[PDB]
Design a protein around this motif. Structure first.
Motif, PDB file in Angstrom:
ATOM      1  N   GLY A 118       0.781  -1.214   0.000  1.00  0.00           N
ATOM      2  CA  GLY A 118       0.000   0.000   0.000  1.00  0.00           C
ATOM      3  C   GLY A 118       0.819   1.271   0.000  1.00  0.00           C
ATOM      4  N   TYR A 119       2.146   1.173   0.169  1.00  0.00           N
ATOM      5  CA  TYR A 119       3.083   2.288   0.133  1.00  0.00           C
ATOM      6  C   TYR A 119       4.104   2.075  -0.965  1.00  0.00           C
ATOM      7  CZ  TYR A 119       1.523   2.883   5.003  1.00  0.00           C
ATOM      8  OH  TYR A 119       0.771   3.030   6.145  1.00  0.00           O
ATOM      9  N   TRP A 153      10.084   3.081   0.482  1.00  0.00           N
ATOM     10  CA  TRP A 153      10.171   4.296   1.307  1.00  0.00           C
ATOM     11  C   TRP A 153      11.501   4.357   2.056  1.00  0.00           C
ATOM     12  CZ3 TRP A 153       5.773   7.446   1.081  1.00  0.00           C
ATOM     13  CH2 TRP A 153       5.891   8.646   1.783  1.00  0.00           C
ATOM     14  N   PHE A 189       9.914   5.719   9.355  1.00  0.00           N
ATOM     15  CA  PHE A 189       9.878   6.324   8.013  1.00  0.00           C
ATOM     16  C   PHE A 189      10.470   7.728   8.079  1.00  0.00           C
ATOM     17  CE2 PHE A 189       6.525   4.037   5.278  1.00  0.00           C
ATOM     18  CZ  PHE A 189       6.597   2.868   6.009  1.00  0.00           C
ATOM     19  N   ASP A 218       7.844  11.410   7.615  1.00  0.00           N
ATOM     20  CA  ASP A 218       6.601  11.420   8.391  1.00  0.00           C
ATOM     21  C   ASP A 218       6.907  10.756   9.733  1.00  0.00           C
ATOM     22  OD1 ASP A 218       4.007  11.839   9.173  1.00  0.00           O
ATOM     23  OD2 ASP A 218       3.253  10.012   8.240  1.00  0.00           O
ATOM     24  N   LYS A 257      -0.951  12.568  -2.890  1.00  0.00           N
ATOM     25  CA  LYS A 257      -1.151  12.520  -1.444  1.00  0.00           C
ATOM     26  C   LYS A 257       0.145  12.208  -0.700  1.00  0.00           C
ATOM     27  CE  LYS A 257      -2.731   8.810   0.058  1.00  0.00           C
ATOM     28  NZ  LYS A 257      -3.634   7.641   0.232  1.00  0.00           N
ATOM     29  N   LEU A 258       1.043  11.432  -1.317  1.00  0.00           N
ATOM     30  CA  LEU A 258       2.238  10.936  -0.654  1.00  0.00           C
ATOM     31  C   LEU A 258       3.528  11.597  -1.129  1.00  0.00           C
ATOM     32  CD1 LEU A 258       1.740   7.019  -0.648  1.00  0.00           C
ATOM     33  CD2 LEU A 258       1.603   8.586   1.310  1.00  0.00           C
ATOM     34  N   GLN A 289       5.705  14.038   1.109  1.00  0.00           N
ATOM     35  CA  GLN A 289       6.386  13.411   2.232  1.00  0.00           C
ATOM     36  C   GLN A 289       7.475  12.462   1.758  1.00  0.00           C
ATOM     37  OE1 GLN A 289       2.437  12.889   3.748  1.00  0.00           O
ATOM     38  NE2 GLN A 289       3.136  13.133   5.876  1.00  0.00           N
ATOM     39  N   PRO A 312      -1.210   7.636   9.879  1.00  0.00           N
ATOM     40  CA  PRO A 312      -0.603   8.968   9.722  1.00  0.00           C
ATOM     41  C   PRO A 312      -0.215   9.323   8.287  1.00  0.00           C
ATOM     42  CG  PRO A 312       0.277   7.885  11.680  1.00  0.00           C
ATOM     43  CD  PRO A 312      -0.633   6.878  11.006  1.00  0.00           C
ATOM     44  N   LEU A 313       0.315   8.376   7.513  1.00  0.00           N
ATOM     45  CA  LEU A 313       0.884   8.703   6.204  1.00  0.00           C
ATOM     46  C   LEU A 313      -0.108   8.498   5.053  1.00  0.00           C
ATOM     47  CD1 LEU A 313       3.391   9.495   4.524  1.00  0.00           C
ATOM     48  CD2 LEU A 313       4.245   7.140   4.818  1.00  0.00           C
ATOM     49  N   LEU A 314      -0.829   7.369   5.042  1.00  0.00           N
ATOM     50  CA  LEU A 314      -1.791   7.094   3.976  1.00  0.00           C
ATOM     51  C   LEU A 314      -3.136   7.772   4.196  1.00  0.00           C
ATOM     52  CD1 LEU A 314      -1.520   3.254   3.154  1.00  0.00           C
ATOM     53  CD2 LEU A 314      -0.603   5.186   1.858  1.00  0.00           C
ATOM     54  N   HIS A 315      -3.451   8.146   5.442  1.00  0.00           N
ATOM     55  CA  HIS A 315      -4.728   8.749   5.829  1.00  0.00           C
ATOM     56  C   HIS A 315      -5.874   7.742   5.843  1.00  0.00           C
ATOM     57  CE1 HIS A 315      -2.470  12.316   5.759  1.00  0.00           C
ATOM     58  NE2 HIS A 315      -2.543  12.554   4.461  1.00  0.00           N
ATOM     59  N   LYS A 366      -7.237  -1.318   4.418  1.00  0.00           N
ATOM     60  CA  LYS A 366      -6.690  -1.602   3.100  1.00  0.00           C
ATOM     61  C   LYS A 366      -6.605  -3.110   2.947  1.00  0.00           C
ATOM     62  CE  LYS A 366      -1.729  -1.253   4.469  1.00  0.00           C
ATOM     63  NZ  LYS A 366      -1.193  -2.621   4.062  1.00  0.00           N
ATOM     64  N   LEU A 367      -6.395  -3.539   1.711  1.00  0.00           N
ATOM     65  CA  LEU A 367      -6.216  -4.946   1.384  1.00  0.00           C
ATOM     66  C   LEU A 367      -4.734  -5.222   1.141  1.00  0.00           C
ATOM     67  CD1 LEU A 367      -9.200  -5.497  -1.096  1.00  0.00           C
ATOM     68  CD2 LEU A 367      -9.119  -5.959   1.363  1.00  0.00           C
ATOM     69  N   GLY A 381      -1.690  -6.605  -0.510  1.00  0.00           N
ATOM     70  CA  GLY A 381      -1.439  -7.191  -1.807  1.00  0.00           C
ATOM     71  C   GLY A 381      -2.644  -7.082  -2.717  1.00  0.00           C
ATOM     72  N   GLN A 382      -3.593  -6.221  -2.336  1.00  0.00           N
ATOM     73  CA  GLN A 382      -4.861  -5.987  -3.029  1.00  0.00           C
ATOM     74  C   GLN A 382      -5.791  -7.201  -3.019  1.00  0.00           C
ATOM     75  OE1 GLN A 382      -4.872  -2.403  -4.199  1.00  0.00           O
ATOM     76  NE2 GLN A 382      -3.143  -2.851  -2.828  1.00  0.00           N
TER      77      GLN A 382
END
Lengths: 125, 125
Positions: free
Chosen positions: A17-18, A21, A46, A49, A97-98, A101, B28-31, B35-36, B38-39
């Motif tokens: 999901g990131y 980093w 990280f 952030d 959005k990212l 940072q 904090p970072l993704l807001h 989430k899933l 590995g989707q």
DNA sequence: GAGATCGATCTC
DNA sequence: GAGATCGATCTC
DNA sequence: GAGATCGATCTC
């Protein structure tokens, strides 16, 4: 040392999901350890952030040398990902959005690399 | 829709930690707060804030979460985890755990939006 | 809207 | 029973 | 839908 990383080492870290980093190996705030066995994990902070930290498997850490590594890390993550959907997610540019940072995080990591291990530990922990 | 939302109180299990009282929270970072991994639809995670230690936060699989009702749940959670961990928490970890339980108990008597407002101090640092 | 996926419903 | 397919759902 | 498959036959 016997361990691959120690506290203060600069590492690229990958969390689902990131984007890849820039991070620094750091003691967990609650347990105070920086490594544990779940396969071995390391705790990271990280850059860019401060409130963001995570336990990461060794397999998702790469010693940080510079921003130039990023493109190849994206490609290799996509090469290993099974599904088309994860491959496509991994290849997307960093989102607005990212990005601010992430950029700050790259700058911080480069500044950290110029300091002694104890200096960067003091400044960023 | 989703099983949890921001402000829900949950027991969270992280390897190397005792079952811990937490609150579902925005990362904090993704807001995002869910989430899933590995989707994959079968791998839903929620982001949580640990009570009792503001800097400690984590992404937890839905399956490693139990809705928080009270401290009395802890023994069964320990027993269930030992089946698939039974020595008592000691030392400094115990004190932080006890403080987290007291906070979760206070939060449990409040409405969702009341506790979200009253526990914003946990997002510091 | 675009891309991908998951599933009830077809042709064979 | 097994593809093929037309979605309907999910993320972006 | 369409091959293998079972029932009572045709016809040899």
């Amino acid at each position: 040392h016997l361990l691959k990383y120690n506290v203060g080492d600069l590492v690229w870290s990958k969390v689902s999901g990131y984007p890849w980093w820039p991070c620094m190996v750091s003691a967990d705030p609650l347990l105070h350890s920086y490594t544990k066995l779940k396969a071995r994990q390391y705790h990271v902070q990280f850059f860019g952030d401060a409130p963001e930290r995570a336990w990461i498997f060794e397999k998702s850490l790469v010693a940080f040398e510079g921003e130039g590594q990023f493109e190849k890390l994206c490609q290799e993550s996509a090469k290993q990902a099974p599904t088309k959907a994860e491959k496509i997610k991994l290849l997307k540019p960093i989102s607005g959005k990212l990005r601010a940072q992430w950029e700050m995080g790259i700058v911080q990591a480069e500044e950290a690399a110029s300091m002694s291990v104890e200096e960067r530990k003091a400044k960023f922990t």
